[PDB]
């Protein structure tokens, strides 16, 4: 349903917007080296949220495939999550984003808005389900004519019995450790399949998780 | 026929409203961010003032999102309701204690108010979900204070009948038009035209209904209002 999806999907961009506005208010507005770049991101997130409301309201049409540089696009996503982490209430370096991208530029046909939603949910999960903190490792590679993204955490894991169930709508693992609706990964799977790709997960209950996304390369 | 239709119409309206209400702050943000990007950011007389407004608009949307999410969770049957036997007197008194304590600090207070308590003497043990019900009392108490005249008295009652536990919360503010006594519990209904979503009482009505109870309001314009909560007793 519309309300539930739009509400769920606005949360990461609102957090990201809040985070950059906070950095600006805290003094970055005085720094000519960074203020314009920060303002540019808030302008982009605000416009993205406005498109998102409309898109999701209309579905109750466009899957807009563009040839995109995944390297840059993934990098832009992770830049926001670093900003969320720095303006976080946690101690500095309580969470780390380590990037492991191949050096060649990878061009892939995607819907930029919808796929950002996918990366947002997985990064946000990777953080939300590491309460004790940790490194989030983000990999970008091409092999066997697939472009593959994997996102690993050192968080709470996922029971083996539930590895399949986690992409189902409303499914939330019911053990100790919060969350919300159980929609993020179902929305994500829907987008990834729509784009001709695949998503899957490996996990160890005490160690952490790795989510994988595969997209057709050429 | 009409039954399914009324439902579908309410849903269609609610969706339309959600889209308009999320859109309006974002549109306001866009306008302040664009002024900032066009150069106001270099200007110390306005950049801080402008940033502050974007921060407030952003907070309002995050509250709206959280509120819309609870409404969804309940609409889904997904919402966890944990009925436990608790002392309503001590729970209500603690709620009022948080509000008295707010006033105890010189802000300066914008407005002074008094919280008058009239509780029954016997202890009322009743099964409820404390986390959710405290939220309900908060929403009514915040309204009661917000719409009180300077120096107004907020009167809080806990009384039981043979069949019911009744809580009432009265203010001496401008009250509510008779045409609207029902509508104030509607999603996004605000009689007025700053922050405030118009979802609080909609959440409250839904929560009180999950708990097996009833909530309603009496008001005489210019007199003030009295909100009631009824809970099944024993
Ligand atoms: N990175 C992760 N580590 C451990 N558990 C995770 C995880 N990412 C997702 N999960 C689990 O999968 C369930 C469903 O995820 P999701 O669709 O994104 O739900 P959500 N967080 O939007 O409420 C979550 O409730 C959580 O139990
Ligand atoms: N105690 C009260 N006195 C006068 N009007 C009241 C009132 N409590 C609620 N109302 C009216 O009902 C409307 C909706 O209440 P509510 O759902 O709590 O709004 P809110 N606080 O989330 O923005 C308010 O805007 C107000 O017009």
Short mmCIF file of C-alpha atoms and ligand atoms in Angstrom, two decimals:
data_model
loop_
_atom_site.label_atom_id
_atom_site.label_comp_id
_atom_site.label_asym_id
_atom_site.label_seq_id
_atom_site.Cartn_x
_atom_site.Cartn_y
_atom_site.Cartn_z
CA UNK A 1 0.00 0.00 0.00
CA UNK A 2 1.10 3.58 -0.85
CA UNK A 3 1.26 5.21 2.56
CA UNK A 4 3.31 2.42 4.08
CA UNK A 5 5.80 2.35 1.18
CA UNK A 6 6.28 6.09 0.80
CA UNK A 7 6.67 6.47 4.53
CA UNK A 8 9.18 3.70 4.68
CA UNK A 9 11.17 5.03 1.73
CA UNK A 10 11.33 8.70 2.83
CA UNK A 11 13.13 7.82 6.10
CA UNK A 12 16.72 7.43 4.79
CA UNK A 13 16.65 10.53 2.61
CA UNK A 14 15.12 12.58 5.48
CA UNK A 15 17.93 11.34 7.73
CA UNK A 16 20.47 12.16 5.06
CA UNK A 17 18.96 15.61 4.50
CA UNK A 18 18.81 16.20 8.27
CA UNK A 19 22.44 15.18 8.53
CA UNK A 20 23.76 17.60 5.89
CA UNK A 21 21.64 20.50 7.23
CA UNK A 22 23.12 19.77 10.62
CA UNK A 23 26.71 19.93 9.30
CA UNK A 24 25.87 23.22 7.59
CA UNK A 25 24.29 24.68 10.75
CA UNK A 26 27.20 23.50 12.88
CA UNK A 27 29.52 25.72 10.93
CA UNK A 28 30.16 24.19 7.52
CA UNK A 29 28.07 27.07 6.11
CA UNK A 30 31.12 29.28 6.79
CA UNK A 31 33.47 27.06 4.81
CA UNK A 32 33.55 27.96 1.11
CA UNK A 33 35.40 24.67 0.40
CA UNK A 34 32.44 22.52 1.39
CA UNK A 35 29.21 24.47 1.79
CA UNK A 36 28.26 24.44 -1.93
CA UNK A 37 28.82 20.68 -2.22
CA UNK A 38 26.72 20.10 0.85
CA UNK A 39 23.91 22.37 -0.40
CA UNK A 40 24.02 20.56 -3.73
CA UNK A 41 23.38 17.23 -1.97
CA UNK A 42 20.42 18.63 -0.02
CA UNK A 43 19.01 20.01 -3.25
CA UNK A 44 19.39 16.58 -4.86
CA UNK A 45 17.85 14.70 -1.95
CA UNK A 46 14.93 17.11 -1.70
CA UNK A 47 14.20 16.81 -5.41
CA UNK A 48 14.52 13.01 -5.16
CA UNK A 49 12.00 12.95 -2.34
CA UNK A 50 9.56 15.03 -4.39
CA UNK A 51 9.88 12.69 -7.41
CA UNK A 52 9.47 9.72 -5.10
CA UNK A 53 6.14 10.83 -3.69
CA UNK A 54 4.76 11.33 -7.19
CA UNK A 55 6.13 8.07 -8.62
CA UNK A 56 4.69 6.03 -5.75
CA UNK A 57 1.38 7.95 -5.91
CA UNK A 58 0.99 7.21 -9.62
CA UNK A 59 1.67 3.46 -9.20
CA UNK A 60 -1.48 3.23 -7.04
CA UNK A 61 4.17 3.97 -14.60
CA UNK A 62 7.81 4.76 -15.41
CA UNK A 63 10.70 2.40 -15.01
CA UNK A 64 13.21 4.79 -16.44
CA UNK A 65 16.26 2.89 -17.63
CA UNK A 66 19.43 4.93 -18.05
CA UNK A 67 22.99 3.88 -18.71
CA UNK A 68 24.69 4.87 -15.46
CA UNK A 69 28.19 4.86 -14.03
CA UNK A 70 27.66 2.53 -11.04
CA UNK A 71 30.99 3.43 -9.50
CA UNK A 72 30.04 7.06 -9.17
CA UNK A 73 26.45 6.29 -8.28
CA UNK A 74 27.39 3.86 -5.49
CA UNK A 75 30.06 6.35 -4.30
CA UNK A 76 27.48 9.10 -4.07
CA UNK A 77 25.23 6.84 -1.99
CA UNK A 78 28.03 5.91 0.40
CA UNK A 79 29.02 9.59 0.71
CA UNK A 80 25.58 10.31 2.23
CA UNK A 81 25.85 7.41 4.64
CA UNK A 82 29.25 8.66 5.78
CA UNK A 83 27.60 12.02 6.47
CA UNK A 84 24.83 10.30 8.43
CA UNK A 85 27.52 8.53 10.45
CA UNK A 86 29.53 11.67 11.27
CA UNK A 87 26.49 13.57 12.60
CA UNK A 88 25.38 10.45 14.40
CA UNK A 89 25.21 10.43 18.22
CA UNK A 90 27.64 7.51 18.39
CA UNK A 91 31.38 8.03 19.16
CA UNK A 92 33.49 8.81 16.08
CA UNK A 93 34.53 5.74 14.06
CA UNK A 94 31.94 3.57 15.85
CA UNK A 95 30.84 2.65 12.35
CA UNK A 96 33.15 2.56 9.30
CA UNK A 97 32.41 2.37 5.61
CA UNK A 98 35.22 0.63 3.75
CA UNK A 99 34.99 0.85 -0.06
CA UNK A 100 36.47 -1.79 -2.37
CA UNK A 101 35.63 -0.75 -5.93
CA UNK A 102 37.32 -2.12 -9.06
CA UNK A 103 39.16 0.73 -10.87
CA UNK A 104 37.38 0.39 -14.19
CA UNK A 105 34.20 2.30 -14.71
CA UNK A 106 31.14 0.05 -14.79
CA UNK A 107 28.21 1.23 -16.89
CA UNK A 108 24.86 -0.46 -16.31
CA UNK A 109 21.30 0.22 -17.41
CA UNK A 110 19.25 1.07 -14.31
CA UNK A 111 16.54 3.27 -12.83
CA UNK A 112 18.69 5.56 -10.69
CA UNK A 113 15.91 6.57 -8.28
CA UNK A 114 14.69 3.02 -7.65
CA UNK A 115 18.16 1.51 -7.26
CA UNK A 116 19.20 4.22 -4.78
CA UNK A 117 16.22 2.98 -2.72
CA UNK A 118 17.75 -0.47 -2.83
CA UNK A 119 21.19 0.68 -1.72
CA UNK A 120 19.58 2.85 1.00
CA UNK A 121 17.66 -0.06 2.52
CA UNK A 122 20.64 -2.38 2.54
CA UNK A 123 23.07 0.20 3.96
CA UNK A 124 20.50 1.29 6.52
CA UNK A 125 19.92 -2.35 7.50
CA UNK A 126 23.66 -2.95 7.65
CA UNK A 127 23.91 -0.12 10.13
CA UNK A 128 20.67 -0.68 12.05
CA UNK A 129 21.47 -4.34 12.68
CA UNK A 130 25.00 -3.68 13.92
CA UNK A 131 24.09 -2.18 17.30
CA UNK A 132 27.54 -2.90 18.77
CA UNK A 133 29.08 -1.02 15.80
CA UNK A 134 31.48 -2.27 13.16
CA UNK A 135 32.86 -2.02 9.65
CA UNK A 136 30.52 -2.00 6.69
CA UNK A 137 32.43 -3.29 3.65
CA UNK A 138 31.14 -2.33 0.20
CA UNK A 139 32.39 -4.12 -2.91
CA UNK A 140 31.81 -3.37 -6.58
CA UNK A 141 33.07 -5.82 -9.19
CA UNK A 142 32.25 -7.29 -12.59
CA UNK A 143 32.52 -10.98 -13.42
CA UNK A 144 30.78 -13.52 -15.64
CA UNK A 145 29.05 -10.60 -17.35
CA UNK A 146 27.45 -9.52 -14.10
CA UNK A 147 28.07 -6.38 -12.13
CA UNK A 148 28.03 -7.36 -8.49
CA UNK A 149 27.63 -5.28 -5.39
CA UNK A 150 28.07 -6.81 -2.01
CA UNK A 151 27.56 -5.10 1.37
CA UNK A 152 28.94 -6.84 4.44
CA UNK A 153 28.51 -6.03 8.12
CA UNK A 154 29.77 -7.37 11.43
CA UNK A 155 26.33 -7.09 12.93
CA UNK A 156 23.68 -9.35 14.33
CA UNK A 157 23.33 -12.17 11.91
CA UNK A 158 20.36 -13.86 10.36
CA UNK A 159 19.24 -17.39 11.34
CA UNK A 160 19.83 -19.88 8.46
CA UNK A 161 16.17 -20.84 8.59
CA UNK A 162 15.23 -17.24 7.84
CA UNK A 163 17.66 -16.45 5.01
CA UNK A 164 14.91 -17.09 2.47
CA UNK A 165 12.11 -15.51 4.42
CA UNK A 166 13.88 -12.14 4.74
CA UNK A 167 12.84 -10.94 1.30
CA UNK A 168 9.15 -11.61 2.00
CA UNK A 169 6.82 -8.66 2.73
CA UNK A 170 6.38 -7.99 6.42
CA UNK A 171 8.86 -10.65 7.47
CA UNK A 172 10.95 -9.57 10.45
CA UNK A 173 13.29 -11.92 12.29
CA UNK A 174 11.83 -12.29 15.76
CA UNK A 175 14.65 -12.64 18.27
CA UNK A 176 16.45 -10.20 20.61
CA UNK A 177 17.35 -7.18 18.44
CA UNK A 178 13.82 -3.05 16.70
CA UNK A 179 13.57 -2.56 12.95
CA UNK A 180 10.09 -1.58 11.88
CA UNK A 181 7.91 -2.80 9.06
CA UNK A 182 9.73 -5.61 7.33
CA UNK A 183 9.22 -3.94 3.95
CA UNK A 184 12.67 -2.69 2.98
CA UNK A 185 14.05 -5.90 1.54
CA UNK A 186 10.79 -6.81 -0.20
CA UNK A 187 10.77 -3.41 -1.92
CA UNK A 188 14.43 -3.95 -2.74
CA UNK A 189 13.90 -7.38 -4.27
CA UNK A 190 11.09 -6.03 -6.38
CA UNK A 191 13.27 -3.28 -7.75
CA UNK A 192 16.25 -5.53 -8.40
CA UNK A 193 14.18 -8.08 -10.29
CA UNK A 194 12.52 -5.28 -12.26
CA UNK A 195 15.99 -4.22 -13.37
CA UNK A 196 16.79 -7.74 -14.60
CA UNK A 197 19.01 -8.54 -11.62
CA UNK A 198 19.24 -10.80 -8.58
CA UNK A 199 19.68 -10.24 -4.80
CA UNK A 200 20.58 -12.82 -2.14
CA UNK A 201 22.21 -12.99 1.24
CA UNK A 202 24.67 -15.02 3.23
CA UNK A 203 24.84 -14.79 6.99
CA UNK A 204 26.17 -16.14 10.25
CA UNK A 205 24.00 -15.52 13.30
CA UNK A 206 26.76 -14.30 15.59
CA UNK A 207 29.21 -12.94 13.03
CA UNK A 208 27.37 -10.76 10.50
CA UNK A 209 25.81 -10.66 7.04
CA UNK A 210 26.58 -10.13 3.37
CA UNK A 211 23.90 -9.02 0.93
CA UNK A 212 24.63 -9.41 -2.77
CA UNK A 213 23.09 -7.64 -5.79
CA UNK A 214 23.74 -8.81 -9.35
CA UNK A 215 22.96 -6.76 -12.46
CA UNK A 216 23.35 -7.69 -16.10
CA UNK A 217 26.52 -6.16 -17.51
CA UNK A 218 26.46 -6.47 -21.30
CA UNK B 1 -22.22 -1.87 -1.93
CA UNK B 2 -21.74 1.53 -0.34
CA UNK B 3 -19.92 -0.13 2.63
CA UNK B 4 -16.88 -1.27 0.59
CA UNK B 5 -17.22 2.01 -1.28
CA UNK B 6 -17.05 4.23 1.76
CA UNK B 7 -13.93 2.36 2.81
CA UNK B 8 -12.36 2.75 -0.62
CA UNK B 9 -13.30 6.43 -0.75
CA UNK B 10 -11.74 7.11 2.70
CA UNK B 11 -8.61 5.32 1.57
CA UNK B 12 -8.45 7.29 -1.67
CA UNK B 13 -8.83 10.57 0.22
CA UNK B 14 -6.27 9.55 2.84
CA UNK B 15 -3.73 8.71 0.14
CA UNK B 16 -4.37 12.03 -1.63
CA UNK B 17 -3.90 13.85 1.73
CA UNK B 18 -0.68 12.02 2.55
CA UNK B 19 0.76 13.02 -0.82
CA UNK B 20 -0.26 16.68 -0.39
CA UNK B 21 1.01 16.81 3.23
CA UNK B 22 4.38 15.27 2.53
CA UNK B 23 4.78 17.41 -0.56
CA UNK B 24 4.25 20.79 1.10
CA UNK B 25 7.24 20.83 3.47
CA UNK B 26 9.52 19.40 0.76
CA UNK B 27 8.43 22.24 -1.52
CA UNK B 28 9.16 24.72 1.24
CA UNK B 29 12.59 23.12 1.76
CA UNK B 30 13.35 23.31 -1.92
CA UNK B 31 12.72 27.01 -1.93
CA UNK B 32 15.04 27.72 1.09
CA UNK B 33 17.79 25.42 -0.22
CA UNK B 34 17.70 27.13 -3.61
CA UNK B 35 18.01 30.56 -2.03
CA UNK B 36 20.91 29.14 -0.03
CA UNK B 37 22.53 27.68 -3.14
CA UNK B 38 22.05 30.86 -5.17
CA UNK B 39 24.26 32.74 -2.71
CA UNK B 40 22.42 33.35 0.56
CA UNK B 41 24.85 30.85 2.09
CA UNK B 42 27.63 33.48 1.82
CA UNK B 43 25.47 35.90 3.73
CA UNK B 44 25.66 35.80 7.56
CA UNK B 45 22.51 37.92 8.02
CA UNK B 46 20.28 35.24 6.48
CA UNK B 47 22.13 31.96 6.03
CA UNK B 48 21.73 30.88 9.66
CA UNK B 49 18.05 31.87 9.73
CA UNK B 50 17.44 30.03 6.49
CA UNK B 51 19.24 26.86 7.66
CA UNK B 52 17.19 26.80 10.84
CA UNK B 53 13.95 26.77 8.86
CA UNK B 54 15.16 23.83 6.75
CA UNK B 55 16.04 22.01 9.93
CA UNK B 56 12.57 22.56 11.40
CA UNK B 57 10.77 21.55 8.19
CA UNK B 58 12.91 18.46 8.05
CA UNK B 59 12.03 17.56 11.66
CA UNK B 60 8.35 18.02 10.96
CA UNK B 61 8.51 15.56 8.09
CA UNK B 62 10.34 13.02 10.22
CA UNK B 63 7.60 13.28 12.86
CA UNK B 64 4.98 12.93 10.11
CA UNK B 65 6.70 9.86 8.70
CA UNK B 66 6.89 8.21 12.10
CA UNK B 67 3.23 9.01 12.79
CA UNK B 68 2.16 7.72 9.33
CA UNK B 69 4.16 4.58 9.97
CA UNK B 70 2.28 3.79 13.21
CA UNK B 71 -1.02 4.34 11.47
CA UNK B 72 0.09 1.88 8.77
CA UNK B 73 1.26 -0.68 11.32
CA UNK B 74 -2.13 -0.58 12.99
CA UNK B 75 -4.06 -0.53 9.70
CA UNK B 76 -2.14 -3.76 8.96
CA UNK B 77 -2.89 -5.53 12.20
CA UNK B 78 0.92 -5.61 12.48
CA UNK B 79 0.94 -3.49 15.65
CA UNK B 80 2.03 -5.33 18.79
CA UNK B 81 -0.55 -4.79 21.55
CA UNK B 82 0.67 -5.99 24.95
CA UNK B 83 -2.12 -5.88 27.54
CA UNK B 84 -0.75 -5.99 31.09
CA UNK B 85 -2.29 -5.36 34.45
CA UNK B 86 -1.11 -1.93 35.69
CA UNK B 87 -1.94 0.69 38.35
CA UNK B 88 -3.73 3.43 36.35
CA UNK B 89 -3.53 5.97 39.20
CA UNK B 90 0.25 5.83 39.53
CA UNK B 91 0.65 5.71 35.78
CA UNK B 92 -1.55 8.81 35.23
CA UNK B 93 0.15 10.66 38.14
CA UNK B 94 3.60 9.96 36.64
CA UNK B 95 2.37 11.32 33.30
CA UNK B 96 1.16 14.52 34.95
CA UNK B 97 4.48 14.69 36.89
CA UNK B 98 6.47 14.96 33.65
CA UNK B 99 4.25 17.91 32.60
CA UNK B 100 4.44 19.74 35.93
CA UNK B 101 8.21 19.34 35.86
CA UNK B 102 8.42 21.00 32.42
CA UNK B 103 6.82 24.08 33.92
CA UNK B 104 9.04 24.02 36.98
CA UNK B 105 11.83 25.45 34.80
CA UNK B 106 11.88 29.13 33.81
CA UNK B 107 12.00 29.14 30.00
CA UNK B 108 10.62 31.90 30.39
CA UNK B 109 7.38 30.13 30.34
CA UNK B 110 5.46 31.53 27.37
CA UNK B 111 2.28 30.72 29.25
CA UNK B 112 1.51 29.64 32.76
CA UNK B 113 -0.96 26.81 33.47
CA UNK B 114 -2.01 24.71 36.44
CA UNK B 115 -2.63 21.01 36.42
CA UNK B 116 -5.46 20.23 38.83
CA UNK B 117 -5.81 16.56 39.75
CA UNK B 118 -9.08 14.90 40.86
CA UNK B 119 -8.50 11.17 41.22
CA UNK B 120 -10.71 8.56 42.86
CA UNK B 121 -9.26 7.22 46.08
CA UNK B 122 -9.36 3.53 45.34
CA UNK B 123 -6.50 2.11 43.29
CA UNK B 124 -7.58 1.10 39.81
CA UNK B 125 -5.76 -1.90 38.39
CA UNK B 126 -6.66 -2.31 34.71
CA UNK B 127 -5.12 -4.20 31.79
CA UNK B 128 -3.55 -1.86 29.23
CA UNK B 129 -0.50 -1.31 27.04
CA UNK B 130 1.42 1.34 29.00
CA UNK B 131 3.76 2.40 26.24
CA UNK B 132 0.85 3.12 23.89
CA UNK B 133 -1.57 4.55 26.41
CA UNK B 134 0.96 7.00 27.90
CA UNK B 135 1.30 8.25 24.30
CA UNK B 136 -2.41 8.82 24.22
CA UNK B 137 -2.43 10.77 27.48
CA UNK B 138 0.53 12.84 26.22
CA UNK B 139 -1.26 13.84 23.06
CA UNK B 140 -4.31 15.02 25.01
CA UNK B 141 -2.26 16.79 27.68
CA UNK B 142 -0.15 18.61 25.06
CA UNK B 143 -3.28 19.78 23.28
CA UNK B 144 -4.89 20.83 26.56
CA UNK B 145 -1.88 22.94 27.44
CA UNK B 146 -1.38 24.32 23.96
CA UNK B 147 -5.02 25.52 23.77
CA UNK B 148 -5.17 26.85 27.33
CA UNK B 149 -5.43 30.60 28.02
CA UNK B 150 -2.54 32.14 29.91
CA UNK B 151 -3.21 31.21 33.52
CA UNK B 152 -5.64 28.49 32.50
CA UNK B 153 -6.38 25.45 34.64
CA UNK B 154 -6.02 21.96 33.11
CA UNK B 155 -8.28 19.61 35.06
CA UNK B 156 -7.46 15.93 35.07
CA UNK B 157 -9.88 13.33 36.37
CA UNK B 158 -9.77 9.59 37.03
CA UNK B 159 -13.12 8.20 38.09
CA UNK B 160 -14.65 4.78 37.86
CA UNK B 161 -18.24 3.74 37.36
CA UNK B 162 -19.60 0.26 37.95
CA UNK B 163 -18.67 -0.67 34.45
CA UNK B 164 -15.92 1.75 33.38
CA UNK B 165 -12.72 3.56 34.16
CA UNK B 166 -13.09 7.15 32.94
CA UNK B 167 -10.29 9.60 32.45
CA UNK B 168 -11.12 13.16 31.57
CA UNK B 169 -8.92 16.08 30.58
CA UNK B 170 -10.42 19.59 30.52
CA UNK B 171 -9.06 22.95 29.43
CA UNK B 172 -10.52 26.45 29.44
CA UNK B 173 -9.45 27.34 25.91
CA UNK B 174 -11.50 28.37 22.87
CA UNK B 175 -13.02 24.93 22.41
CA UNK B 176 -14.12 23.17 19.22
CA UNK B 177 -16.96 23.95 16.77
CA UNK B 178 -19.85 21.48 17.25
CA UNK B 179 -19.61 20.50 13.58
CA UNK B 180 -16.06 19.24 14.28
CA UNK B 181 -16.40 17.28 17.47
CA UNK B 182 -16.18 14.14 15.40
CA UNK B 183 -13.70 15.30 12.84
CA UNK B 184 -10.89 16.15 15.29
CA UNK B 185 -9.98 12.50 15.44
CA UNK B 186 -9.58 12.36 11.62
CA UNK B 187 -6.20 11.92 10.01
CA UNK B 188 -4.77 15.35 9.16
CA UNK B 189 -7.74 17.21 10.60
CA UNK B 190 -6.49 20.46 12.20
CA UNK B 191 -9.10 23.20 12.90
CA UNK B 192 -6.37 25.76 12.35
CA UNK B 193 -4.02 26.83 9.61
CA UNK B 194 4.20 26.02 12.35
CA UNK B 195 4.56 22.35 13.25
CA UNK B 196 1.77 19.94 14.11
CA UNK B 197 0.65 17.17 11.82
CA UNK B 198 -3.03 16.62 12.66
CA UNK B 199 -2.33 12.91 13.13
CA UNK B 200 -1.96 12.78 16.93
CA UNK B 201 -5.62 12.37 17.78
CA UNK B 202 -6.05 9.85 14.92
CA UNK B 203 -3.33 7.71 16.41
CA UNK B 204 -4.93 8.13 19.84
CA UNK B 205 -8.37 7.10 18.73
CA UNK B 206 -6.92 4.02 17.07
CA UNK B 207 -4.83 3.07 20.07
CA UNK B 208 -7.73 3.50 22.45
CA UNK B 209 -9.83 1.25 20.22
CA UNK B 210 -7.17 -1.47 20.16
CA UNK B 211 -7.22 -1.39 23.96
CA UNK B 212 -10.97 -2.06 23.98
CA UNK B 213 -11.90 1.49 24.95
CA UNK B 214 -13.52 4.70 23.72
CA UNK B 215 -12.39 8.30 23.34
CA UNK B 216 -14.44 11.37 22.52
CA UNK B 217 -14.67 15.03 23.20
CA UNK B 218 -17.19 17.51 24.55
CA UNK B 219 -16.78 21.19 23.91
CA UNK B 220 -18.62 24.47 23.95
CA UNK B 221 -16.91 27.10 21.78
CA UNK B 222 -15.39 29.73 24.07
CA UNK B 223 -15.80 27.50 27.15
CA UNK B 224 -13.07 24.93 26.62
CA UNK B 225 -12.99 21.23 25.93
CA UNK B 226 -13.17 18.00 27.78
CA UNK B 227 -11.68 14.83 26.29
CA UNK B 228 -12.83 11.49 27.61
CA UNK B 229 -11.29 8.12 27.65
CA UNK B 230 -13.31 5.10 28.75
CA UNK B 231 -11.69 1.74 29.56
CA UNK B 232 -13.53 -1.48 30.45
CA UNK B 233 -13.27 -2.11 34.17
CA UNK B 234 -12.92 -5.67 35.59
N1 LIG C 1 22.14 -6.54 7.68
C1 LIG C 1 21.23 -7.30 8.50
N2 LIG C 1 21.73 -7.97 9.56
C2 LIG C 1 20.91 -8.70 10.37
N3 LIG C 1 19.58 -8.76 10.09
C3 LIG C 1 19.05 -8.10 9.03
C4 LIG C 1 19.86 -7.36 8.23
N4 LIG C 1 19.08 -6.81 7.24
C5 LIG C 1 17.80 -7.21 7.42
N5 LIG C 1 17.77 -8.00 8.54
C6 LIG C 1 16.60 -8.63 9.06
O1 LIG C 1 15.59 -8.83 7.83
C7 LIG C 1 14.41 -8.44 8.20
C8 LIG C 1 13.60 -7.78 7.07
O2 LIG C 1 14.35 -6.68 6.57
P1 LIG C 1 13.60 -5.39 5.97
O3 LIG C 1 12.70 -5.75 4.80
O4 LIG C 1 14.65 -4.45 5.40
O5 LIG C 1 12.74 -4.80 7.18
P2 LIG C 1 12.81 -3.38 7.87
N6 LIG C 1 14.29 -3.13 8.57
O6 LIG C 1 12.48 -2.36 6.80
O7 LIG C 1 11.77 -3.36 8.95
C9 LIG C 1 14.72 -7.36 9.27
O8 LIG C 1 13.61 -7.24 10.03
C10 LIG C 1 15.92 -8.00 10.00
O9 LIG C 1 15.39 -9.00 10.97
N1 LIG C 2 -7.87 20.65 23.69
C1 LIG C 2 -8.22 21.18 22.39
N2 LIG C 2 -8.80 22.38 22.33
C2 LIG C 2 -9.15 22.93 21.13
N3 LIG C 2 -8.88 22.26 19.96
C3 LIG C 2 -8.30 21.05 20.03
C4 LIG C 2 -7.96 20.49 21.22
N4 LIG C 2 -7.38 19.29 20.97
C5 LIG C 2 -7.38 19.11 19.63
N5 LIG C 2 -7.96 20.21 19.05
C6 LIG C 2 -8.15 20.40 17.68
O1 LIG C 2 -8.02 18.97 16.95
C7 LIG C 2 -7.12 19.13 16.02
C8 LIG C 2 -6.32 17.85 15.78
O2 LIG C 2 -5.69 17.47 17.01
P1 LIG C 2 -4.36 16.61 16.81
O3 LIG C 2 -4.60 15.37 15.99
O4 LIG C 2 -3.78 16.24 18.17
O5 LIG C 2 -3.33 17.61 16.13
P2 LIG C 2 -1.76 17.56 16.32
N6 LIG C 2 -1.27 18.01 17.83
O6 LIG C 2 -1.16 16.21 15.91
O7 LIG C 2 -1.29 18.47 15.25
C9 LIG C 2 -6.20 20.28 16.52
O8 LIG C 2 -5.59 20.95 15.52
C10 LIG C 2 -7.23 21.20 17.19
O9 LIG C 2 -7.82 22.05 16.13
#
